[PDB]
């Protein structure tokens, strides 16, 4: 029941970057989408993704809008292609956690079989390690009450065999 680590396919990171670039996201703006894969074991496998329409107010972090209908309509098309890649959470371009992220995460709790994963993908990556930070929501305990917070989980990259050759092929031009 406890997730302990996350693996991510290279395609997911490239898809997040393509989403960021094709929507001309700049400045402090972020793009947001869904991640797919398998979260029924202690290692969450993140193997696909898709972009969401998403707007949020520049200053008021309390004003944001995510199209429920888009989530459902697109996930159903993904189901028709590969039913094994379940909706397991969401991603955004960060580069860091934002004040609205716990409330947005509550929206995705209605779509996931397990506790949702948030993947922050730093698409403006300079050179220091994996451009990802993975989080799940937990209750954190003063020891008189608890509050919801995010727990960082370690990530590694895991590529399917043909996708790994794809990456090497791209790198070799």
């Amino acid at each position: 029941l406890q997730h302990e680590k996350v693996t991510i396919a290279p395609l997911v990171l490239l898809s997040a970057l393509d989403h960021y670039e094709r929507t001309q996201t700049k400045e402090n703006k972020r793009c947001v989408g869904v991640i797919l894969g398998d979260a029924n074991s202690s290692t969450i496998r993140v193997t696909n993704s898709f972009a969401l329409p998403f707007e949020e107010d520049e200053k008021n972090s309390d004003v944001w809008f995510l199209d429920h209908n888009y989530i459902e309509n697109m996930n159903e098309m993904c189901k028709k292609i590969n039913a094994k890649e379940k909706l397991i959470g969401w991603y955004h371009s960060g580069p860091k956690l934002r004040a609205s992220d716990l409330k947005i995460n509550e929206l995705f709790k209605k779509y996931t079989q397990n506790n949702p994963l948030l993947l922050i993908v730093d698409v403006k990556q300079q050179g220091v390690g994996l451009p990802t930070d993975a989080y799940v929501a937990i209750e954190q305990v003063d020891g008189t009450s608890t509050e919801k917070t995010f727990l960082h989980l370690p990530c590694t990259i895991e590529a399917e065999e043909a996708e790994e050759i794809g990456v090497e092929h791209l790198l070799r031009d």
Binding site: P10, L11, L13, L14, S15, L17, D18, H19, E21, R22, T23, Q24, G33, N48, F50, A51, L52, P53, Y70, N73, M74, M77, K80, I81, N82, V123, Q125, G127, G129, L130, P131, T156, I157, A159, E160, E161, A162, E163, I165, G166, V167, E168, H169, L170, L171, D173
Partner: protein
């Protein structure tokens, strides 16, 4: 003289779809632009369900991608040959004829996801003569994609 440029996510999605569909031939649509007389730019692809192309599925996917900043037109189709190389069968030629009637520049890409695991991607791009011929394929990589992929490879295998 003509080149088909394939984006990073287009290549990986075609390999992924083809691998997941083994032992079946799976197919999808290629999105992009006919930028001039000598260049087809494939910026993205999407899978079609196994089945005669489902026009309702295609239209819906196109509508939703436009809503998230992907408004490129269909420039052709891809499908997988799991283990037996890149070429067009008679059924493939008929399918390509349908695409060429809609746009004379449409391209048929064939990927072999099984032979690809031996170390080099096995992929080709075809158009009909009026039986068929191969188009040169090249890959488009942005500086950001190159840096991302180089860093991921170094992190994974050091």
């Amino acid at each position: 003289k003509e080149t088909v440029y394939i984006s990073s996510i287009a290549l990986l999605k075609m390999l992924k779809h083809g691998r997941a569909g083994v032992p079946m031939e799976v197919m999808g649509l290629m999105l992009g632009e006919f930028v001039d007389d000598y260049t087809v730019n494939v910026v993205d692809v999407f899978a079609m369900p196994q089945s005669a192309v489902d026009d309702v599925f295609q239209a819906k996917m196109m509508d939703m991608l436009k809503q998230t900043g992907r408004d490129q037109m269909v420039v052709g189709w891809y499908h997988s040959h799991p283990g037996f190389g890149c070429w067009l069968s008679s059924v493939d030629v008929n399918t390509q004829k349908s695409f060429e009637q809609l746009n004379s520049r449409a391209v048929a890409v064939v990927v072999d996801p099984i032979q690809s695991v031996k170390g080099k991607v096995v992929i080709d791009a075809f158009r009909l003569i009026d039986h068929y011929y191969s188009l040169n394929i090249d890959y488009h990589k942005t500086a950001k994609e190159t840096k991302m992929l180089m860093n991921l490879h170094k992190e994974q295998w050091q």
